[PDB]
Every structure is written in structure tokens, then in C-alpha cells.
Structure 1
């Protein structure tokens, strides 16, 4: 038929983050995705410099209005990510509500960007007054959430130390509304070694209500990447759509695609930088286009273990 995705995320002229990381991948996979750029910057804030303007509530509403007037406010998925403005996010919520009112089956894939951890623990890189809005108004509306450990901790108030406390916290989120919760990265240890970050997933469905929990030990890459979480949420949406009731497979293809892309990025980043020289943010920009075939049909280089 036709799968339309409304994607309200950031836009950078140069590089791949927000809608730049989310759009191409989703188009290559056959999704009619529409990109509302919550901001337009020359590049991500991971660089020394950056310039750009921002889209305010009034404008997002103005834009949604045009879609409504034309009777084009019927979607199958809504995708959202990083937001700094409290009022902006409220407006986003009002939009999703009406989009779900228009189509009762619409899926809201929310990546609750609040902050991350470095070494021991983290710090939020978003106004704190936004946390309440997420717990109360955003997550309840969301059907799929993809937070990292630190964000899953902030949304639940419960700190995570082990695979079991993580499932407990994921279980809490589920009761908040999300039928699919995926922790995209964590400090949890792996039997594979110290060079492995851990992904955990949890999906609630009926077949008769039944759960499906999966685990994944992904090898770390010696560098900091931007736009990877957005690409994760974006590809999760895609493969979950193509393989419903199979979180295992959907996650294996998602993480695998991330693998290939980063594998190619780090390589070009090394050859482009000096051997023995830490690549710069610019050299570490996801080699998105060069990864078209991996995104289309990613070679599964990772098996998720059922919990």
C-alpha cells in the first residue's frame, strides 16, 4: 500500500544527524517520509563552530495547518528526536494526538533525547524542565521508545546496574504506554569483553498478551559518533514495520545496519586522518550514502539472544 512517516527532527546542511540520518535510510527502504526540520544548522554542535536558525511552535503549527487544510494529515508513523524547547515539544505532542485521532493505528516512534553518560555517569544536554513533559505527555503517547541507559533512568527514576534492573525499568516504561522499549546503549558488561556496549529490547504484544525480550552484545568502535541514535530509531521503525511481532529480527537488522555504516565510517575516517591521529568530528560524519546497499539488506553480523 503506502507507509507515510512524519519525521520532525533536526536538519544540518553538512553532515548526518536528525532528519539527515533518518530520511535517506527511510527513503531507500520504500517509506514515504516527510521531514519537518525543527532546526536548520550548518552542522551539528559537535564542531568548534555552528550557525543556524530554529523553528518555533507557531511555525510548526503553521506548517501542520497547511497539511491539514490539504487533508494530508494522515500518517502511519510519527518520528521525533532531539528537542530543546519545552513549548516546541508540547506542540509536537498536540500534533501526534490529532494524528492518532485521524488514524487510530498510527505508530509514534519517540527517541526521548535527554542526555547520555560518559565513563561513570552522565549529564543532560537538554533543559531539565523538559523531563516532566516527556514522562507525563510524550512517553504515554509513544508506541516505541529508544532511550539509552541514562534516558531510561531519567524517565523512570530507577538507576540501572544490571540486565535485570534494566528489564525492570523497561517494564516500568511499558506501563507508561510504550508497547516497545529498546535501550539503545548501556554500561552493562558483556561476557565478550570490555569492548562491547549492550543493547536491550522489550516488546509487549498479544497472540493473548505475551512478552519478547532480547539482548545484544555489540562491539565498541573507538570514536564518538553523532546521528547514530536517530539512525537507530529510524531503522528500528523500518524493520519493525517489515517484521512485526519479531523484535529479535528487527533489532538484528537495525544493529547490523548501524554496524556496517560505522565500520565504513571509521575506515574512511582513519585513511582520511593521519594513522595514529584521532579523527575529527568532520571525518567521523556517517558515510550514509556510501552505505545504501547495507541499509537496503544488511548482512546480519549479530545474533540477538532471547531473554
Structure 2
């Protein structure tokens, strides 16, 4: 009787409120631009709170705009508290330069979590990474002291990359047997799901064929804790991409929310989704500028719209191994 299944259309499903306090640009896709469409095309009731609003990202030679301040995001957040619209399922965080905006973000994550003990604060540390081998931070020299004790302790999910992963532990990674150790070192700070978005640790398939690894505990079982882990390698989509960071944690949110406590398929639909993007991204970068040389930011921007088709459900292009 497939006839009472259609009046289901009339039902109240779930509203998965996602407070995503990130940046917004006019042209291009970084931060919140990058985090919404996907999360929306995936049924999430996501709310965007601009941190900035630059004409474009800071990856081009120029940019102009404004930077929302702590005092502003404070008013911004109360307005909600007033008409009582301050209650989320997931608070999503990312790249942030100023320290006061970071403490404020916390407070909001903090109260939201005192207004809702159930909140899932998917947190992605704005620390920095490595370009010509050596590694540098990409923010003020005292953002870590904040990320260390008031952010990560509050977060339920983090997506460090090697350089940052290390910084949120105090040790350092030289092998595969340490990015799991340092991952053990981060839950003690709080995150119960830890992934190391990028690194340098080799793999049975080359340096080009880069890695991804992660761990997820839950001492929820009657007695003690249980802990599952995975890892995976992915050819290096050579081309240089910016926004990808922001999108990762988003899709690593959706798929996470949508599936059981198994980073495996969760992480597979996720790290895969980046592929059905980037491919269709690199491909066009060359579709126009002089049939004889490497592209530019604008000739390289994330072809995000076009990926709707794919976003709604990816064709797994990479497999993972269980541990």
C-alpha cells in the first residue's frame, strides 16, 4: 500500500540547525560560501554568521571588505537570544584571525552548549600548515593558547592537519604510529572524533598519493570506552585549491550526522565528495587561459554549483582500511 507513504510528505522531519560562523566573500567559494550549498543540498537547516565579507578571498592579490568583530557577533547572537532562536544542533567553526572574536565564538559555543548539552561543535583549527616543506602558522602568535584551552576542550570534532594536529598535542609526528598517538593525545583535550586532514607521512602508493587518518572514541558503553579508527590515501589532485579546507569539515559533518558511529563510510563519502568537486574544478581551470600554462585562483576556483548532482550523493572514488 505505497499510498500512505506519500502523506508522509506532510510530516515534521528533523531540523538540523547548523550555526556556521565563518567568512563570506562575494566572488568565489571559501568558508561559509563553501560550507552552505553542500550542507543545504543535503537537507541541513544551516544558518550563516559572517566573520568577514571580502569581495573575494585572500588568495588573490587584492581584497576589500569588512571583518565582523567580537562586539558585533555579540549583538548578532543576542538578537537571536531575544526572539529565542538561539538553539542549534551543530555549531561549525573555522579560520579566524582575531583573538577576541575567538573567545566570543567560544562563549556562544559555550552558552549554546549550556542551552543545549547535546550540541555538536565541529571544530576545525585555523592554525596553519606547510607549503615549501617548512611549516608556518597562518594567524596571530597567540591564537593557539586560545585554541588549546578554550576551543578544543569545547569541541566535539576537530579536523587538524599534520602541522596543527601536532600543535594541539605538544608532541610531533614522524610516522604513521604517531599520528594515531597524537590523535590519542587530542581526545584528552576533548574532541571525540579526530581526523588529520593532510600530512606528509608516506603511504604504500607514493608521496603524490597523500593520506588521511582518524580516530573516534565514545566511553558511552555501559562500562568503559570503545574506539574505532580508519585511514586512507588519495592521489594528490596536483592543482592548488582554496576553500577545500572549509568544505571538508562541512561534509565531514553531514555524512557524520547522517550515519552511525563509523568514520569509515562516513569519512569515505566525505573525503570522496571533495573529489567529485576538485576534478570538475581542475578540468575547467585549463578550459580557458592560453592553451599553454598553469592557472590562477580565478581560473581555479571551486566549481561548487555544478557539483550539486554529485554532492547529493558521491560515487566513492577512494577506499579505506580498518584498524
TM tier, shorter chain? over 0.9
Q: C-alpha displacement at 1:244, in angstroms?
A: 2.4
What is the TM-score with the length of structure 2 in the denominator? 0.93
User: Using the alignment, how far apart are the partners of 1:115 and 1:285 within structure 2?
Assistant: 21
- Match in the other structure for 2:118: 105
The answer to whether structure 1 residue 188 and structure 2 residue 201 are counterparts is yes
Greater fraction of residues in helix: 1
User: Using the alignment, how far apart are the partners of 1:206 and 1:114 within structure 2?
Assistant: 28
2:230 partner SS = strand
2:66 partner SS = strand
The answer to whether structure 1 residue 154 and structure 2 residue 170 are counterparts is no
- Match in the other structure for 1:141: 154
- Match in the other structure for 1:271: 287
User: Using the alignment, how far apart are the partners of 1:257 and 1:9 within structure 2?
Assistant: 21
User: Using the alignment, how far apart are the partners of 1:172 and 1:273 within structure 2?
Assistant: 47
User: Using the alignment, how far apart are the partners of 1:121 and 1:217 within structure 2?
Assistant: 22
Q: C-alpha displacement at 1:276, in angstroms?
A: 3.6
Q: C-alpha displacement at 1:205, in angstroms?
A: 2.0
- Asked if the contact 1:145/1:178 (under 8 Å) is kept, the reply is yes
User: Using the alignment, how far apart are the partners of 2:251 and 2:126 within structure 1?
Assistant: 17
- Asked if the contact 2:232/2:319 (under 8 Å) is kept, the reply is yes
Larger Rg: 2
User: Using the alignment, how far apart are the partners of 2:191 and 2:297 within structure 1?
Assistant: 34
User: Using the alignment, how far apart are the partners of 1:245 and 1:52 within structure 2?
Assistant: 41
Q: C-alpha displacement at 1:209, in angstroms?
A: 1.7
User: Using the alignment, how far apart are the partners of 2:207 and 2:291 within structure 1?
Assistant: 24
Q: C-alpha displacement at 1:274, in angstroms?
A: 3.0
User: Using the alignment, how far apart are the partners of 1:205 and 1:264 within structure 2?
Assistant: 37
What is the TM-score with the length of structure 1 in the denominator? 0.98
- Match in the other structure for 1:238: 254
User: Using the alignment, how far apart are the partners of 1:221 and 1:275 within structure 2?
Assistant: 20
- Match in the other structure for 2:237: 221
Q: C-alpha displacement at 1:191, in angstroms?
A: 1.1
Moved more, 218-227 or 234-243: 218-227
Q: C-alpha displacement at 1:192, in angstroms?
A: 1.3
Structure 1 segment 169-180 matched on structure 2, within 5 A = 169-180=182-193
- Asked if the contact 1:200/1:214 (under 8 Å) is kept, the reply is yes
**Aligned length in residues:** 307
Unaligned runs of 5+ in 1: none
RMSD after superposition: 1.0
Unaligned runs of 5+ in 2: 1-13
- Asked if the contact 1:205/1:245 (under 8 Å) is kept, the reply is no
Cα distance, 1:95–1:223 mapped onto 2, change above 3 Å:
same
User: Using the alignment, how far apart are the partners of 1:244 and 1:144 within structure 2?
Assistant: 15
Q: C-alpha displacement at 1:206, in angstroms?
A: 4.5
In the TM superposition, what whole-angstrom CA distance separates every residue of 1:55-108 from its partner, at most 9, and x where no partner exists?
011110001000000111111000010000000000000001110111111000
Q: C-alpha displacement at 1:273, in angstroms?
A: 2.6
- Asked if the contact 2:200/2:207 (under 8 Å) is kept, the reply is no
- Asked if the contact 1:7/1:34 (under 8 Å) is kept, the reply is yes
Q: C-alpha displacement at 1:113, in angstroms?
A: 1.1
Cα distance, 1:119–1:216 mapped onto 2, change above 3 Å:
farther
User: Using the alignment, how far apart are the partners of 1:47 and 1:297 within structure 2?
Assistant: 31
